[model samples]
Target: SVLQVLHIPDERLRKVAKPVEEVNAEIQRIVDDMFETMYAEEGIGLAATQVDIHQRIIVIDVSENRDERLVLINPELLEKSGETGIEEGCLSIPEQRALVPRAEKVKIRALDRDGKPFELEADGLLAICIQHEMDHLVGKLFMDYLSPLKQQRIRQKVEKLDRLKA
Candidate 1:
């Protein structure tokens, strides 16, 4: 059940997701599939939009270091601070990593597997990844962060990549 990763310019990837009501069997299925897809693709995070599902859910596993994996449902950004620029890549736009200014610290709230709630204050890569995926839930893509001219250039490049992909 590895969901296919949607590419840039696909409307599904820009769709704003609806909130997840609970982390039931269906949600669990998505989490499992997302984990499988993400690991197979060597991606650290997977948003619902990536799978053509416009639901406010995302799965992240930075546990290459054996830390705990994260599966967030209906996440909300509570606080963010201290800007730092980092290069970012997206599964939607393959082979493109660009420097983007992102918050160094982020406080996020989300529901766990049982519909329970929890909050996390994260910094560094975790914070950046969370913010990136949250942006996806709101119909924002990483390319949107670039200047209009840069976005146009990237869009053309992505189009060429898409053609090659086919």
Candidate 2:
């Protein structure tokens, strides 16, 4: 089932995600639905926060064909370096894009679906996707990194977007 991706200013999205207790089947189920929601919205990444779940879970498939599904549970950055920026859009804040500063490379630790831990080194576009989704775990959105004026514009656009959608 595809879950609803909460829009900006929902307030629930501001909740800081709590660490997963364990990566049981339930967690994997949510991950599966997260992927479905992201794919449905044509998004490259999604956090559990986007679906009104305050858990440190993220689903990402930056592959050109969206075939390389990845799940990060209780993910944390072990190392991040190099300065780079990416223009990013979010499912929560549809049609809004921002130039977000990100680390060019990162090493991350996360739990797999079965409670096993793993680490990966990533760089470039994949790195940006990782960091962007990770920020959501802490109740941070890409627009939050922008100036207040820019954020105001984003909020207005999102408001109109939601109104027309409704």
Candidate 3:
């Protein structure tokens, strides 16, 4: 099932997610649905909160062909280095793009789908995607790195879209 990807101005996106106690079958379902929703939206990453679930779960598949799917539960950033500017977008904030500063490389520790702990290192677009999705778990969005005026404009744009949808 494809879950709804919450859009901006929906205050829920700002709530910090609770860490997953364990990666059981239920968590796996959420991961699967996240991937489905992300692919349906043509997004590379998605956080559980993006679907209105306050769990520290994220699904990412930055692969060119979208073959590689990764599930990170309760992920923590172990290390990051070298600031890099990357054009970032979000499923939550559709049609919005901004150049956001993020670490060029990152080391992260997280639990796999089975609750097994693992550490992975990533760079380039993968690193940026990781950081962006991770931010969502903490009640943060890539737009937070933008200016207030920019954010206001984005909010207005989103509101207009919402009106059209309604």
TM-scores of all predicted structures: 0.95, 0.96, 0.97
Q: How many steric overlaps are in each model, in order?
A: 0, 0, 0
Arrange candidates by lDDT, highest first: which order?
3, 2, 1
lDDT (10s digit) by residue, model 1, range 108-162: 9999867789999999899999998898898898888889999988888988999
Which clashing pairs does model 1 show?
none
Question: Model 3 over residues 1-166: C-alpha lDDT tens digits?
Answer: 9998889889999999999987789989888888899999999889998999999999999889889989899999999999998778888887888999899999999999889999999998989999999999999998898899999999999889888988
On TM-score, the stronger of 1 and 2 is 2
RMSD after CA superposition, every candidate: 1.3, 1.0, 0.9
27: Cα error in model 1, Å: 1.0
Which regions of candidate 2 fall more than 4 Å away from where they truly are?
none
lDDT of 1: 0.87
lDDT of 2 by residue, 126-164 (tens): 899999998888888999899999999999999998999
Best-to-worst ranking by TM-score: 3, 2, 1
Task: Return the lDDT, model 1, position 157.
Answer: 92
